[PDB]
């Protein structure tokens, strides 16, 4: 059964006059006139191509005849792709081992709330001229004020004056897995970047333990299933900054979602997969910026954190890239999901129950504060 119904598809142009068949005599056409007449057989005009080119009417060339064409089938994970298996497809793609708990380092860094009730209320209650602000309106406000709270805790921790946050930085990174060539494209969220690289979080003992540890298989789902099958792609890797950029080392990636429509939002597992792929893309791009492009096991692993969208429900991630030898030893990812600060916000009274959040918890904000403060 072929889609593309006949009545909607383009019909056949009408049969030519048979003077075109008869050899050899030139038909008398309405090309000498500059209009159609219903007698006087229709001419065959030559294919007209504009000799110069206008900017306003460009027709892009077919995908065979582009300057940088790669015959191997490529894949791109840009910001929109939502993985089927989610977190485990992410783990297989990036060659990592997952840890359910956040590390004791940042928990010790855990070991005011008036302003936290102020930020929850200011985001979901007080910020717009009408009632009920939408998710596109309240979620970046939450994460922006939490970043501001850390940049206020500058007083207790004085070495946070060496890290600035970036708004619209893209990046890119590529590698192989079978071999089959993959890629990750840049975010649109905040990129908190610092001048001093992050400390190594797991030792060589845990590195060899993950080397012993194996990946997982999810047949018959191929591990490229929601990856955008991309053609020509500019394989060159990119941290989205010119050389000599102050605050180079990417501390934390803040990934946020607008689009209050639930089918437009990311699912929690697909969002964790997005965090894993984006943290790995940033980490690998930093690794090939600093060291060579060769596939090897890094003696100095890189650490990149990430924080998830959907201001009610938070996901935190710490990603240690210790190997760029893909296709052995595995990277490490300490993740935790569904922290859920402010379970629910009743914005209008129900008829009893007052306006404001219900189901509040501050240990998730403590995790946020630590995960900011991990560098210093």
């Amino acid at each position: 059964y072929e889609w593309g119904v006949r009545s909607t598809r383009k019909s056949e142009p009408p049969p030519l006059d048979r003077v075109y068949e008869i050899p050899g005599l030139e038909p008398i056409t309405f090309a000498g006139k500059m209009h159609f007449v219903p007698w006087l057989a229709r001419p065959i005009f030559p294919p007209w191509d504009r000799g110069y080119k206008d900017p306003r009417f460009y027709r892009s060339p077919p995908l065979h005849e582009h300057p940088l064409y790669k015959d191997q089938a490529c894949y791109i994970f840009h910001h929109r792709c939502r993985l089927l298996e989610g977190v485990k497809q992410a783990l297989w793609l990036t060659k990592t081992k997952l840890i359910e708990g956040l590390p004791e380092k940042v928990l010790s860094l855990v070991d005011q709330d008036e302003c936290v009730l102020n930020v929850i209320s200011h985001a979901r209650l007080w910020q717009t001229t009408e009632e009920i602000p939408k998710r596109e309106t309240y979620c970046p406000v939450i994460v922006d004020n939490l970043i501001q709270l850390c940049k206020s805790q500058i007083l207790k921790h004085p070495s946070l004056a060496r890290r600035i946050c970036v708004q619209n930085s893209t990046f890119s990174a590529t590698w192989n897995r079978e071999s089959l060539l993959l890629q990750v494209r840049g975010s649109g969220g905040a990129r908190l970047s610092t001048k001093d690289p992050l400390p190594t979080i797991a030792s060589r003992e845990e590195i060899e333990a993950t080397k012993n540890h194996v990946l997982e298989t999810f047949y018959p789902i191929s591990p490229i299933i929601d990856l955008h099958e991309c053609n020509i792609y500019d394989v060159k890797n990119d941290t989205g900054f010119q050389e000599g950029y102050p605050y180079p080392y990417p501390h934390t990636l803040y990934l946020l979602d607008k689009a209050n429509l639930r089918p437009h939002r990311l699912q929690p597992d697909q969002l964790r997969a997005k965090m894993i792929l984006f943290a790995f893309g940033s980490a690998l791009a930093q690794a090939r910026l600093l060291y060579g492009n060769d596939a090897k096991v890094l003696e100095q692993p890189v650490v990149v954190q990430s924080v998830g969208t959907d201001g009610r429900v938070f996901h935190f991630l710490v990603f240690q890239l210790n190997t760029t030898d893909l296709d052995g030893v595995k990277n490490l990812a300490w993740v935790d999901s569904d922290q859920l600060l402010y379970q629910h916000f009743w914005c209008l009274p129900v008829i009893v129950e007052p306006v404001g959040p219900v189901g509040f918890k501050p240990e998730t904000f403590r995790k946020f504060l630590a995960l900011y403060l991990h560098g210093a």
Binding site: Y1, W3, G4, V5, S7, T8, R9, L84, Y219, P220, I221, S222, I224, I225, E229
Partner: protein, 217 residues
């Protein structure tokens, strides 16, 4: 009228397509079919009916994993979103395939009648004799047009040297070629025919208005 049919799409998309109602009217603009109009607004999920359609530059019998069984507004069965290889698609779900089952699409004609589960699909040579099948195609490769409504199951009565006999749910018999593909098992939404429509409102939501003058004579 200016009736372009809404079904202009060429590529098999998995996303729903915005489906235009017709009112039972031709391209000429006049009523052709009476009693149609004004249902709930729906969207069309593009069902791949070729159950054995191996993906691009691939091989024979392959495996798919069911992702989600779902209500389809545009038919009476349930649609299973299934995924196999690098592509995913909608199929009609037979009964008792949940989210997580694995189904097999084989064109292989094994000499022995394959001991197969209820969800998967093989040609009738691999199916045994007297077997409950639903998505049945007449010629091989065209795609299934027969038993695929909710709760219907046609039986395979006998296997002949180059053909086979199907009892279609109208107590009918149909000669099919040996090599065409068919899915085993009965279709989902059983108990569907024992749904009382209830209100004329419920009928009018389904999209069937009361219409008189049904004989333009």
């Amino acid at each position: 009228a200016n009736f372009v049919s809404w079904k202009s799409r060429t590529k098999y998309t998995i996303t729903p397509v915005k489906m235009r109602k017709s009112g039972g009217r031709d391209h000429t603009g006049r009523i052709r079919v009476h009693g149609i109009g004004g249902g709930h607004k729906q969207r069309y999920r593009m069902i791949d009916f070729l159950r054995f359609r191996p993906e691009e530059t691939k091989s024979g019998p392959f495996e798919e994993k069911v992702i989600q069984v779902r209500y389809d507004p545009c038919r009476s069965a349930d649609i299973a979103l299934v995924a196999g290889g690098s592509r995913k698609r909608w199929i009609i779900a037979t009964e008792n395939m949940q989210a997580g089952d694995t189904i097999l699409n084989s064109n292989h004609i094994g000499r022995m009648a394959v001991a197969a589960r209820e969800g998967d699909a093989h040609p009738l040579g691999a199916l045994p004799v007297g077997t409950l099948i639903n998505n049945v195609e007449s010629e091989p490769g065209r795609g299934a047009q027969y038993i695929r409504a909710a709760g219907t199951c046609g039986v395979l009565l006998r296997k002949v040297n180059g053909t086979a006999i199907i009892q279609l749910p109208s107590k009918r018999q149909m000669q099919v070629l040996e090599t065409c593909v068919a899915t085993v098992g009965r279709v989902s939404n059983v108990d569907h025919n024992k749904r009382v429509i209830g209100k004329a409102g419920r009928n009018r939501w389904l999209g069937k208005r009361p219409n008189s003058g049904r004989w333009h004579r």
